[PDB]
Write a protein that binds this ligand. Structure first.
Ligand code: GTP
Ligand code: GTP
Ligand code: GTP
Ligand code: GTP
Ligand code: GTP
Ligand code: GTP
Ligand code: GTP
Ligand code: GTP
Lengths: 221, 221, 221, 221, 221, 221, 221, 221
């Protein structure tokens, strides 16, 4: 009937470190539909200001599609009600070596221009008492990515979230991404990409562990 | 003091073919600055509906950046004042074989979701009386690309525009593109790409010519 | 309050050609939850027959996960209530060249062993009166794929469905896939893959069009 | 007339470490044929709940094929009667440098969804008194792989089994795998892969050794 | 009404280190058009000295094109009026790990022959109190690149400029490039490329930090 | 004591077809040295106009280098005194199948901006009475490339030149190139390339021969 | 006690077609050892003319090594006593489709400069009454390759020899090679390669057969 | 009127280290033309000993071509009058990090068999007081390469020459090459290549510097 234990813990953990995405507390419990109608209205206006003919079949539904996309899709991560269900199992295997999930599909939106960020994450962790379900790592990366973002902040949030859930600081996150506000606009750099890393526990502390992780990052197909 | 001879011709040709992007005639000669301020206003409202903290340094200038992007950047192609300066030379070389410009960078926006379209175009033409300046082919592709688009329409527009400018129907246009409204959202298909082609003159009529062009399309790096 | 016009038409079209997947009409309007509890019960038994310790945290929820996966996920295409919302726009562009969507992600299950089929589809069509929304092609391929399948049948169903929706026989479908019941079991062939094609209208009729499509099939990344 | 010396030793070692796959002791010495018939029965029921027409030629033998697959194929590793015949030779060569077998085909099933796990293992060991037959390394990996698994556990099992058989703790195991329960369903991440490692003896203790092994891991074709 | 605080600061810092490109102070505030007409005249003479027929439509506008290129394009970085607008945000994320922007498109001209330098830059920095906008790193690299250059000096300039702007010495710059004065002329080495690096702060001091950066350098596509 | 028979014939043939690069007849038999001194002076002026400090060691010799480059280097192809020594052998082998030389290095300069053109040529011909020395094909391509060029013209010149020298119209020339005036400036398209072809004799006439050649063109490494 | 039946027939066929490599009949039956001593002496003189210190251990044996190489190695194909032993089997399989041996290692020496030619041959034939041993095709290519060659001639020679041996004109030979007299000297083109083909029977006559062969040529690894 | 200051110093340095290629001092100041005529004669004899028909147009000029090649081409590095003109600039940039020129085209001849050596050199140095012109590094590599060589010696020679010229011991040279006397003859190993390195100053002394260099060696295209 509310946020899960994990959603709450992770959110609290992020607020405490001052890492939460700039979001304002629920000012009014207004149904999403009203938000979507409102947003669509604004988009109708913007399109009119761009002199686009909204009468055309190809543009007619765009304001509603954009509203739905903002509220229901690309920024779904802002609502913790969409936080992934987390499942863990006892580390009976007694695994004390890192588990790495590489090339995680990452789709995000840069907050400076509200434009596509296309990337891939690599997450590693040394299991302590529990082993997390592999897909949950993918879902967590994707939860934070479905928000207007700053890559540097995104990498931190995923790290903190995982540390919190796994009960260990021994987590490492790395994200490699192409920002379309850099690529298809402005400086229009067709080839560059940005890499950001957030190292936890031994990944930070131990150069041995650190470089094992870093060496593993970016392995072509 | 107005649109170039070329911009006027191309625009006319497109209107004649019913190919123009759904744009409404200049209802009011209002300076771009007011449109940008009004659009920025709407974006501000939208971000507030999304509960984003516009007081944050990273989000504070977003509404302005987006308004500037829509009006001055990604949709610059909607304004024929931005049409490329066309330069040609006499076909003294008597070239009667196609000239092909492959892998032309193409950055566009889909009009259904106002999301990134990342593509590459391949354009070929058989010189009649004139040889067009190479970069002009790239600029024309980019001119029509910088608009809310439907890839199928975009391909048509580039073909007509080039036929008009080159004074020959023997032009062929092929665009291969990734639609982020397909890739990073909805069906979320991380691998697909869409190919559209517009064949004219001999490229449509002559199977020999047609397949020479088609075979040439898509040559890895 | 029922199936959409398109879902109905497509289903009727498939039944008429005898191409429907072997599915029995709704014998009882029993809620999915009962089906899932029933299926989970069966899976509990099977696991017990395999002497697996369902008391272990890692196996405890498997019967429920499998039930959910069968009913709600991997065979969701069996229920036309899950048929994609189809959107089309007038072919005002007057496009009379084929539109190809290549490398469509295809995830299916072979009906002989209920094992993973991992593939990619390539769909082409010559627009007649309408142009279909690009993602709808991806969603249609995926609707039929989320069913116990025989690749040869799958390719036919997608073809017929598209022809029906697009109002044209000029459609071509090609699927390239790896069957894990061939790869990870039995003959254990680690390298082979199967290609199946269903050519419609001109794709069948015209060798010119046919080979243009076939030549386009399979383009590495 | 029973399990080999090796199968017995390895099984004991695994039980000792609490590493055995959740399997219950032989409650009844019932012939595989009855289990297969009962499992096939349950699959029949499931397919009927999914409304599949079992009268169809393609679906008619499915319940039998699945029962045979579970009992005799994909889970064959659960029965130590299937343990590989181990052959070793005297380390007369006095090899005191690691021997590495890379890219070992690995086909497994995740126990959470009973779906395909497609992977590759890399195994290294420093010969003490004996040199193991190369193919035995592959067969052992495949022995534990043919079971409902948790990749983290699987890696542990292979390490212990090999240490036991080789009489040395100096063994290292690394598995890279694609989980179809992640890729073709749920989060549906088409690009990620999971890497797990189990380091023993010098591979754990000696950083020089450890990194020699880690550097060697993942060498494209 | 003059240079930005940033442009001034960067220019001062470069002059202080004796790193500025050999440029003479504004001897006369003469309008660029005069320079372009003067340069165009010199180019006209040169072409005449080469016996090129400036009457030809293809050559006629060359003197004016080269003039425009030197003054307005390829050497635009010589004028700090063209320095990029820098944006930074508070490092609230508390990022204390390097941020790397790789494969930055770099287009320069060698000062020895005024011929094309085609290259790519990799820049990394450890955020201190502020996080710079990603595109700014790209624009800065390009600002200094659009000048007659010596690759060794160019790397130094970008390093110092970034250190100045970021307020940290923890910055690293690496550039890999092809010099057409080497490739398409003289020794005509079609295969060589040159790599230069400029390490600051921890990138120079800490071998751990240094090699992390160096390892990251050059990652194919 | 003058131009070779071949140099004369080729030059004549090109003038006849109106294919010669826009060059004016020797107005004065002035030694290259004074042309170099004058060009150097104009360059010194240009650099001064750009405010470059010619006192610097790195810039001091630039004017001389650029003068030496224009006169003695990059445009050496304008002087038929540099035409390659042609050697042929009797086609005693009776070869009546095309001989193709692919991936011929081609370094040229666009005449619109006097910038680098980096490309590769593919030449094929059907030997009639004589077989040409293989390197001569490379030298001829390079002869015409070392000139201010228009790619479309360059291809034409190599075709006529070779036909003349081989005494057969059965020659085909294809050039693929990157124009730095398009890549590193203006539209700044980092990915495009231009392909031009000049087909003679059977390569023009016979579609069989034509497509054998065209298929052959562009074979990666 | 002399040349094999095949060596004789092949040599005869080549002489008839005027395809033999310029070799003079055995003027004197002088033992190879004397030729080597004479050749060695000439090389000793040459090296002295080059002022090389033959006293040095690294140069002392060179004259002998070069003599041995010319006589016994690189030009062994000049002596038909080195012709490969040919083995054929009855075409009981009734194969009437081409058999293609691709990527045959080919090492030759150009006769213009006596410098390395590195290439690969592709041979196809339609079996008539016999099927030749696969390795014999490779040995034949190498027989003719081990001679001072002209690639165009070499291709002809292999074709004729094979037709003779196989008793069919339906043979096709293609050779792709890098000539070091072009690459490491003179024009010094580091990227070009030459392709020659010799098509017989149906490969020449039938465009269907001809293009099946040509399409097959050059398949990367 | 004699050898340059650099040619002298370099030659001296090599003699001091006993690294010069086995060359005898100018016994007689005889014009190259006579050497070529003498060498040509010896080659004529050799070819006659091989029974080659020098009357043939393809072989007639070979003796002259080989003479010209030995004297004027492939062994030009033996004469210091061909030493490259060296240009350096003041290290005003204060670069104290290595500058690396990778993939330098290297064409040599092995002295054991006077056969092609195809390789690539990688040179790095830490600038002390001067920065050398980039192309000079390539010209130096090629100066020493154009001699009858021993790869191990060649690598040493380039290292010493560069240290001499740059006035620093901090130079590193690495060469990767294919010897045709190994590949196309004798053992006929078609896949092997040899790698030699010469490390000076810090490249030898500092493992940090040494491994930064080694890691940089061999970067595919
Ligand atoms: N550090 C960081 N910067 C980002 C990110 N997304 C966008 N940016 C940058 O934030 C900045 C926005 O700068 P402004 O100068 O305010 O807007 P702009 O003028 O449109 O920027 P330009 O792209 O350089 O044209 C740009 O430099 C963007 O590239 C991100 O995730 N992290
Ligand atoms: N033909 C065509 N369709 C496009 C293009 N860009 C976007 N579309 C499609 O236009 C359609 C929008 O359909 P709607 O159903 O109206 O919106 P939606 O529900 O968000 O669509 P889904 O992406 O399928 O979730 C989608 O199928 C888009 O993929 C384009 O360039 N051409
Ligand atoms: N044509 C076709 N065959 C399929 C498909 N999926 C699975 N199969 C095959 O259908 C057959 C099942 O054959 P059976 O012989 O009944 O079962 P099986 O003995 O387990 O088959 P083996 O895999 O050969 O061990 C196999 O040959 C499967 O490879 C599909 O989509 N199309
Ligand atoms: N650690 C680990 N987890 C696995 C493995 N195979 C599957 N899993 C995960 O175990 C978990 C099952 O979680 P549940 O939440 O119980 O099932 P689910 O809701 O279908 O999970 P989703 O895939 O996230 O939709 C998933 O996160 C799987 O990806 C494995 O080998 N190791
Ligand atoms: N260190 C360095 N050298 C450069 C750069 N750009 C060009 N050069 C070199 O500066 C030198 C110019 O030398 P000069 O001998 O004065 O001119 P040049 O005779 O045309 O030189 P060659 O190219 O060797 O023919 C060459 O060695 C160029 O390769 C650069 O960025 N850095
Ligand atoms: N057609 C053909 N020509 C070859 C072959 N091997 C070498 N050649 C060429 O035969 C010619 C020898 O020409 P010459 O002009 O007599 O000697 P050269 O001056 O040293 O030739 P350049 O390499 O152009 O410097 C060159 O053009 C070689 O590239 C071959 O197999 N076939
Ligand atoms: N056809 C052809 N055009 C060329 C070639 N080299 C350069 N060009 C083009 O010739 C034209 C010069 O056009 P102008 O408009 O006169 O000069 P510009 O404004 O600097 O051109 P932009 O490059 O578009 O900025 C450009 O479009 C160049 O890309 C060539 O070989 N062939
Ligand atoms: N170290 C070194 N050896 C070389 C080089 N070039 C050639 N060689 C070798 O020097 C040796 C010549 O050996 P010999 O035994 O005198 O002549 P050979 O019998 O023809 O040698 P084989 O190639 O083994 O048939 C060979 O082993 C060559 O491979 C080089 O650059 N460095």
């Amino acid at each position: 009937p509310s946020l899960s234990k994990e959603a709450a813990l992770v959110h609290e953990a992020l607020v405490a470190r001052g890492l939460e995405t700039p979001l304002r507390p629920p000012v009014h419990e207004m149904d999403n539909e009203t938000r979507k109608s409102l947003i669509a209205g604004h988009m109708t206006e913007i399109m009119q200001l761009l002199n686009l003919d909204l009468a055309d079949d190809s543009l007619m539904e765009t304001p509603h599609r954009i509203a739905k996309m903002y509220v229901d899709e690309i920024f779904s991560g802002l609502d913790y009600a969409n936080f992934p269900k987390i499942t863990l199992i006892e580390n009976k295997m007694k695994v004390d070596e890192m588990v790495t999930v590489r090339d995680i599909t990452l789709t995000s939106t840069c907050e400076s221009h509200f434009v596509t960020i296309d990337g891939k994450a690599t997450v590693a962790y040394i299991p302590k008492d529990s082993v997390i379900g592999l897909s949950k790592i993918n879902r967590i990366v994707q939860f934070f990515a479905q928000r207007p973002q700053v890559q540097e902040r995104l990498t931190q949030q995923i790290l903190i979230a995982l540390q919190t859930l796994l009960g260990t600081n021994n987590v490492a996150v790395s994200i490699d991404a192409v920002h379309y506000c850099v690529k298809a606009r402005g400086i229009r750099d067709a080839t560059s990409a940005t890499t950001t890393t957030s190292l936890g526990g031994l990944f930070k502390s131990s150069q041995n562990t650190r470089h094992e992780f870093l060496r593993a990052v970016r392995h072509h197909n």
